[PDB]
Design a protein around this ligand. Structure first.
Ligand SMILES: [Ca+2]
Ligand SMILES: [Ca+2]
Lengths: 62, 147
């Protein structure tokens, strides 16, 4: 029931805390409290640096 | 992308004896549009080599204090390198040079001969500061084990 694009921690907002999770996840770290369902931001089937790129864009455009 | 250039990500070559630690570079060339994003995977023979370090060239990869250069080795025999400009403007890659350095440990019981370092061409991504595709091209490297 997380309907906010890029809200990896499912706290209602999209900010640098979600960027931290994406970065830590891309490095292969275990991210506690992460919503794995929110990682594929551009809906292309994979979770990679282009989802981080999109996430950094969304924050700057807020 | 307006230039319609093809950026090439190349992996270098190195020779070493069994048990040696060897350094091989990863280079980017034919850069024209400022690059804000790079995703690339490098495949290696896990039975022969163990990843020791994957470090950026800070004279080219800036803002590494804010995690612009991410490394993932969670998959056997694969190194995933992600470069992103955290500012989307201030720290792009705009010249040809070395992107990173790969340090491998050669298994002491490794056999002599070449072992390719392959850049996955289907996962290679290169984009500008607004995440727009830049045409990419992969060039493989290798490690020559001497005996
Ligand atoms: Ca959030
Ligand atoms: Ca994606």
């Amino acid at each position: 029931s997380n309907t906010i694009l890029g809200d990896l921690n499912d706290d209602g907002v999209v900010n640098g805390d979600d960027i931290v999770m994406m970065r830590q996840y891309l490095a292969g770290k275990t991210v506690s409290g992460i919503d794995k369902n929110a990682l594929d931001i551009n809906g292309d089937g994979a979770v990679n640096g282009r989802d981080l790129m999109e996430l950094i864009k969304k924050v700057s455009n807020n | 992308s307006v230039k319609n250039e093809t950026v090439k990500l190349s992996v270098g070559t190195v020779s070493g004896n069994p048990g040696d630690t060897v350094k091989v570079p990863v280079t980017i060339s034919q850069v024209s549009t400022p690059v804000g994003l790079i995703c690339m995977d490098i495949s290696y023979d896990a039975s022969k080599f163990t990843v020791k370090d994957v470090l950026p060239n800070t004279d080219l990869v800036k803002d590494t204090d804010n995690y612009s250069f991410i490394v993932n080795t969670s998959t056997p025999g694969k190194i995933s390198i992600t470069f992103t400009d955290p500012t989307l403007a201030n720290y792009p890659i705009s010249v040809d040079g070395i992107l990173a350095y790969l340090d491998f440990i050669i298994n002491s019981n490794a056999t002599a001969g070449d072992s390719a370092l392959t850049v996955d061409p289907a996962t290679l991504i290169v984009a500008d500061e607004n995440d727009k595709d830049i045409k990419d091209a992969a060039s493989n490297g290798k490690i020559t084990v001497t005996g």
